[PDB]
Amino acid sequence: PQITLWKRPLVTIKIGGQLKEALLDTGADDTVIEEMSLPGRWKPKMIGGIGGFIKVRQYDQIIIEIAGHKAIGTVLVGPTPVNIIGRNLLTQIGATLNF
């Protein structure tokens, strides 16, 4: 499907067995998800945005469903006010920006 940008590009995702809303974000290098109880090994990482950096948990090889597309990759979990799907997973599902 094709998504115009008149509204935030929000989609349903599945992660750890749970349905969530997240923002398709071409301006993000990485995927960051709100604090949740996710199984898997992780390590601490700093990630940055406008306003500086936050401390997140980095989980590798996490299976995530994005608008019905499966993808496996790194997920960061931390105090974001919004779930965002970054380029590391957008590429996995074949997303592109067109105009």
Add this chain to the structure above:
Amino acid sequence: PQITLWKRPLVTIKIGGQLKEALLDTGADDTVIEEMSLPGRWKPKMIGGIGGFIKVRQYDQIIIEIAGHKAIGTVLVGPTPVNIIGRNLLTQIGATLNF
């Protein structure tokens, strides 16, 4: 025109007669440009993202060119580490997300 996301989606912009590089960011409501001198009336605003908030100058009705496309809209000027083209201008250049 189609842009894959294996790398940051950066393009050349012209603002205030100066050339700059900016990120096309479907996750950003607003367009934010690094500190520069811009003619025009403006008002203070604070905008928020991953590490929190920054103070910006809001300029309305700025003529800007993005990847060869003309647009006129609101531009926020402030201490962002990366120039960002948000949805307010991406809709004017007819960007869509495909996947």
